[PDB]
Amino acid sequence: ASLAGAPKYIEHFSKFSPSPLSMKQFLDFGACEKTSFTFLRQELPVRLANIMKEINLLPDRVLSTPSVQLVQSWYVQSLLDIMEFLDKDPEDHRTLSQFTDALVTIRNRHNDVVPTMAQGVLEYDPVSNQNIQYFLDRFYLSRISIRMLINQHTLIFDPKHIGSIDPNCSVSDVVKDAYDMAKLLCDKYYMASPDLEIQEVNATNATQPIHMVYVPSHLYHMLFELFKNAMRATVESHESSLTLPPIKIMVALGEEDLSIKMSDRGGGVPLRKIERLFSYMYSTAPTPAGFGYGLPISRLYAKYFQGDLQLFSMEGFGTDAVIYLKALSTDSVERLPVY
Amino acid sequence: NASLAGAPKYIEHFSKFSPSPLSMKQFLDFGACEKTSFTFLRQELPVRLANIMKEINLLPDRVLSTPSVQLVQSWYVQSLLDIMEFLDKDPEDHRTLSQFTDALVTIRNRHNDVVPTMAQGVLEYQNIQYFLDRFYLSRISIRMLINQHTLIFDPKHIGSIDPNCSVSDVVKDAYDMAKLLCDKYYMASPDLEIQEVNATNATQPIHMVYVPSHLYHMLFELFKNAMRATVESHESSLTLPPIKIMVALGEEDLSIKMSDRGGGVPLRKIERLFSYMYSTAPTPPLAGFGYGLPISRLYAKYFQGDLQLFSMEGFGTDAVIYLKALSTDSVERLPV
Ligand SMILES: Nc1ncnc2c1ncn2[C@@H]1O[C@H](COP(=O)(O)OP(=O)(O)O)[C@@H](O)[C@H]1O
Ligand SMILES: Nc1ncnc2c1ncn2[C@@H]1O[C@H](COP(=O)(O)OP(=O)(O)O)[C@@H](O)[C@H]1O
Ligand SMILES: [Mg+2]
Ligand SMILES: [Mg+2]
């Protein structure tokens, strides 16, 4: 559309606040298309103008980076493209198929938003107020939630999953799948990697495998990112590829929490440096894993449905990464930056 | 006891100064001499007292006006006045020194119950948390100083400080004491398992320069909780999960982990645990005080460390005491 109105467009949708959807609200779409449209055509412009508003809030030295604009360029196009629809008849086959088509386009378009934003923060002209952290947590939680919305539509309308959501998800399988992927990268690089051990303790069901209502891709993302960190730490901390300590996983289901602990003997980190580990600016790796966003982003994924991710180390010994999730669908509610 | 009518003026004076934290080596440095101690204590002690007493009144009218609280305050006033008498006595004089240690002893015995007394004061019932952390941190610090002079000036240790402190040894002593209380209450308690990974040299017992009683107390407090949580979570006395200890020594940190299979606590409640107002046991054996965790964490912070609890609901909990491994980094931390 007319792209001069864009200022006016954000000032308007920015006046609205995000409306979090519960898992039951997400799950109950079998609801209908005109439901996913009617609501998406107002909700996404609201979500996109809110976070673009925070994008001209960036430091004039990162804002001017090329990569930064690129991604801004994507968002101005992805608000207009959905505004083309704010008047169309939710009742004809093509308004509906045109929307899904638009959505396909926006999701493919933003698939490199992080490696790109990551190039706007790498290439950036030093160090005192890296207020790049605050925005990026917010920028990336908003991004996950928009990709949530889009994928659900695009999947539901284009195991037995309702969108990207699996109602009976085997934590263990996700963990194994994510171990396999991570390990493949390790071996292709160091030609060595620790083994894997899985443990379960179902407090709610003393003998039944732990399953849950969740989005496997999100879990895979967390577990993968963490496994990569743990195999690196392990490898870099030993000498003999024949005696590398296995990575141990512990799955605990309680009445309120679903807890996953990834323990390694990767040498640990001083208590002094544990908050650092989440710095978008911090990475102990030979630059371009080694783009230091693996940890803040994974936590943003845990916090997205009322979870969290915390790391506890013992210098000289190893480290404990724990993922905390809500056990009950009833508690899994969408988390977003202030709205 | 100076006349207590000058009390308002004395606080405002020494409250104008700031505490000066000593390094672990400055403590060790007293083998300088007593006269140095006396001359530094008679300035430092009033400074730290008047500083924390001036915040005692920053308390809410509700809790300050509690007899337990007002009773503690009366103690501090008297201690301040007791010390103040040595402000113009001859340091080079034999009597003045042995009179000072005579006075510190009186103060130390008089404050011996400040915590359970404060506690009965809280019982008379939440920023309270902010005050209490600082109050109790300052108090551990004032007890540090008093104990150094009394023990040093009147067997390898330099006061309460052991230069070759065996972490496992303290861990054992704390497990046994705690263990004793439990059995006498539940008549069942976990066993204990200890492991160490001396990263810095690989097969030697981890030792450190530290205050054995401080480490003891932290480990003592934590052991009770884990053995309790474990008893409370299980139904069989012949199959009770042992408590596991990990001692890790690295270039910067000295790490002690106490892992228990006591069924743990939801993530929503972890902050609570360090609340002076929080306890899962009665107001009263083994538990009920509800300050075992916050103070223990205060002991850890004192010489620049920390105490952190991590749980997995349904399984168990990890309690970790972090210290500095190097004496060069251990300087006492203190409230204003
Ligand atoms: N299990 C671990 N043990 C020791 N250090 C770790 C571990 N997890 C991550 N770290 C540290 O935190 C840094 C940043 O983590 P991450 O987000 O995965 O970034 P990246 O892998 O791109 O460096 C790593 O470079 C590493 O030094
Ligand atoms: N290892 C543990 N497992 C589960 N809960 C614990 C553990 N540690 C402490 N807690 C909880 O935190 C509360 C407060 O801890 P604490 O300071 O020791 O107080 P108190 O023992 O007087 O209740 C306990 O009542 C208990 O419910
Ligand atoms: Mg990484
Ligand atoms: Mg206790």
Side-chain angles (χ1 to χ4, degrees), chain A residues 106-321:
Chain A
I106 302 176
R107 185 197 69 238
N108 282 315
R109 183 160 62 212
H110 290 221
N111 276 305
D112 297 318
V113 158
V114 161
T116 304
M117 285 285 294
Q119 190 71 0
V121 175
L122 169 143
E123 152 244 349
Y124 172 82
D125 189 340
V127 149
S128 185
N129 299 318
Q130 284 141 2
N131 280 268
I132 295 125
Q133 175 69 38
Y134 181 80
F135 163 74
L136 266 56
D137 272 318
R138 304 167 67 75
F139 174 78
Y140 293 140
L141 215 229
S142 116
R143 156 155 203 279
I144 299 151
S145 83
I146 285 130
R147 247 184 65 226
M148 198 45 210
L149 304 182
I150 283 149
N151 293 146
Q152 288 303 293
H153 189 281
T154 326
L155 274 178
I156 295 203
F157 299 91
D158 68 340
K160 143 71 180 180
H161 315 174
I162 302 109
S164 45
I165 301 161
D166 185 352
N168 53 275
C169 171
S170 175
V171 181
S172 296
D173 269 319
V174 181
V175 165
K176 296 198 201 116
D177 288 1
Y179 171 77
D180 288 350
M181 267 313 308
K183 180 188 181 99
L184 219 30
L185 300 214
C186 199
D187 269 36
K188 270 177 191 272
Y189 197 93
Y190 297 114
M191 319 194 58
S193 66
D195 286 298
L196 169 80
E197 256 158 50
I198 298 185
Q199 230 94 302
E200 266 183 50
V201 186
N202 186 332
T204 313
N205 217 48
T207 293
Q208 150 186 45
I210 285 155
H211 288 58
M212 68 165 325
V213 173
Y214 211 75
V215 184
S217 59
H218 284 42
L219 195 55
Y220 173 84
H221 187 107
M222 292 178 274
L223 288 178
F224 174 70
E225 287 307 300
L226 291 175
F227 271 112
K228 272 172 50 191
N229 282 352
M231 300 173 306
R232 180 174 162 226
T234 298
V235 175
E236 277 182 14
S237 295
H238 293 79
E239 41 118 23
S240 171
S241 70
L242 319 169
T243 58
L244 252 41
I247 316 176
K248 331 238 262 267
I249 301 290
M250 224 303 274
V251 171
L253 170 62
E255 278 65 294
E256 197 192 305
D257 296 354
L258 200 342
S259 293
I260 317 163
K261 190 208 282 151
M262 186 191 303
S263 294
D264 72 62
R265 261 136 300 169
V269 176
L271 180 67
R272 176 167 53 88
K273 290 201 214 158
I274 284 281
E275 256 187 275
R276 258 186 211 217
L277 297 197
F278 283 88
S279 190
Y280 292 102
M281 341 293 304
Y282 188 85
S283 170
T284 291
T287 281
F291 5 57
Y293 49 72
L295 264 180
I297 287 205
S298 279
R299 176 212 270 166
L300 292 194
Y301 273 99
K303 295 203 161 174
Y304 179 46
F305 268 111
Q306 306 302 323
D308 191 35
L309 201 162
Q310 309 176 328
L311 253 64
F312 305 113
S313 200
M314 310 219 271
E315 194 190 30
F317 169 76
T319 296
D320 281 7

Side-chain angles (χ1 to χ4, degrees), chain B residues 232-248:
Chain B
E232 277 183 335
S233 46
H234 301 293
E235 48 177 58
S236 181
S237 51
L238 328 167
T239 40
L240 256 52
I243 312 267
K244 319 160 141 217
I245 291 283
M246 183 45 85
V247 171

Side-chain angles (χ1 to χ4, degrees), chain B residues 107-119:
Chain B
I107 290 154
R108 190 204 68 206
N109 293 335
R110 167 191 310 163
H111 288 244
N112 260 289
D113 289 58
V114 162
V115 169
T117 308
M118 283 289 305

Side-chain angles (χ1 to χ4, degrees), chain B residues 202-220:
Chain B
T203 171
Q204 152 182 49
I206 290 160
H207 280 61
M208 69 177 316
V209 176
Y210 203 70
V211 186
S213 54
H214 286 210
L215 189 58
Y216 175 84
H217 191 79
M218 298 192 283
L219 284 164
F220 175 64

Side-chain angles (χ1 to χ4, degrees), chain B residues 60-72:
Chain B
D61 292 1
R62 289 281 194 146
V63 58
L64 217 171
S65 48
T66 301
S68 287
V69 171
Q70 298 154 320
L71 177 54
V72 173

Side-chain angles (χ1 to χ4, degrees), chain A residues 201 203 250 252-257 259-261 269-272 308 310 312-317 320 322 324, chain B residues 197 199 246 248-253 255 257 265-268 306 308-315 318 320 322:
Chain A
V201 186
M250 224 303 274
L253 170 62
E255 278 65 294
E256 197 192 305
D257 296 354
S259 293
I260 317 163
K261 190 208 282 151
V269 176
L271 180 67
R272 176 167 53 88
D308 191 35
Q310 309 176 328
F312 305 113
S313 200
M314 310 219 271
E315 194 190 30
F317 169 76
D320 281 7
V322 192
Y324 294 105
Chain B
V197 186
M246 183 45 85
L249 177 71
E251 296 136 38
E252 194 189 301
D253 309 345
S255 287
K257 189 149 81 170
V265 183
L267 188 73
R268 182 179 39 82
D306 205 6
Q308 295 178 354
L309 239 90
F310 357 113
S311 215
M312 293 179 88
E313 166 168 52
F315 176 56
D318 285 341
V320 174
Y322 311 92

